[PDB]
Amino acid sequence: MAEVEETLKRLQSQKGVQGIIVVNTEGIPIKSTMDNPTTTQYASLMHSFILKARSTVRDIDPQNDLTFLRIRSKKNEIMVAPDKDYFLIVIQNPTE
Amino acid sequence: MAEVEETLKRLQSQKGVQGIIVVNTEGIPIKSTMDNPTTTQYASLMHSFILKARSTVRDIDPQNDLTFLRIRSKKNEIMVAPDKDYFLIVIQNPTE
């Protein structure tokens, strides 16, 4: 938990970050700064993102693994990837 | 089409590139450098990939549109995004 808190501090301290969400293996948002309705949705939505893309990646090759999933949108970029036992979600302005 | 072809030559000319594929909205790989079975599979799950995320993003909000899909793997990084009427896919070694 502290790990995410250490990164959230610098993120929320810098300009560009819109909010950081953290979901556990159970699916519950252990921590989040986004909106109420925006967090609850992102929790499952994001969690399902890596879950869906994962089953697909397996088709890309026999021996593969997921460790990064970005999606540059029109509003902002939300970084999401599989962690030890949780799903990190970093939302902020676009970089591309 | 030519645009993608111009970028393919340079890519195939440089190291790192594993293989580039060019699929349309219908599902026909106008261009491909990978293997026979490797192309069909890639172009197969390709359309299924965008259709998967595009279906999820709809939950994030009403007004939006994906324009970048990157997935860092263990074998290589596969980046794909929506084009004029096709889906460009650049496969090569990892960058980050």
Side-chain angles (χ1 to χ4, degrees), chain A residues 48-64:
Chain A
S48 142
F49 194 45
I50 296 169
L51 239 53
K52 223 63 109 107
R54 168 136 69 77
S55 212
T56 311
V57 179
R58 301 272 178 74
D59 238 310
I60 306 175
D61 260 315
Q63 312 178 72
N64 233 333

Side-chain angles (χ1 to χ4, degrees), chain A residues 41-42 45 49 52 56 59-61 63-75 96, chain B residues 41-42 45 49 52-53 56 59-60 64-75 78 96:
Chain A
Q41 172 243 293
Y42 274 44
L45 199 292
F49 194 45
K52 223 63 109 107
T56 311
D59 238 310
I60 306 175
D61 260 315
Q63 312 178 72
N64 233 333
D65 247 276
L66 277 297
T67 190
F68 232 97
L69 216 60
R70 315 180 239 193
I71 42 179
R72 218 235 96 185
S73 344
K74 279 218 108 170
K75 279 250 82 186
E96 195 69 41
Chain B
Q41 170 260 278
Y42 271 54
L45 90 90
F49 182 45
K52 199 85 87 162
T56 354
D59 225 71
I60 302 168
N64 223 276
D65 234 75
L66 245 298
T67 183
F68 219 128
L69 246 51
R70 224 150 166 279
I71 313 99
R72 218 214 91 184
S73 345
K74 290 202 82 181
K75 271 270 271 215
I78 311 179
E96 241 148 47

Side-chain angles (χ1 to χ4, degrees), chain A residues 7-20:
Chain A
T7 299
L8 249 90
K9 290 254 279 212
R10 199 97 232 282
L11 256 52
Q12 234 137 121
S13 185
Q14 65 164 350
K15 228 235 154 202
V17 178
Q18 254 164 70
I20 312 91

Side-chain angles (χ1 to χ4, degrees), chain A residues 4 7 20-23 50 79-83 86-90:
Chain A
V4 188
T7 299
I20 312 91
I21 301 156
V22 204
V23 193
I50 296 169
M79 271 211 316
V80 176
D83 229 280
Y86 48 96
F87 280 129
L88 216 142
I89 302 124
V90 181

Side-chain angles (χ1 to χ4, degrees), chain A residues 30-46:
Chain A
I30 42 151
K31 249 237 83 261
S32 168
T33 71
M34 297 259 50
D35 229 303
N36 237 135
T38 305
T39 297
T40 326
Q41 172 243 293
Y42 274 44
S44 266
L45 199 292
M46 298 297 128

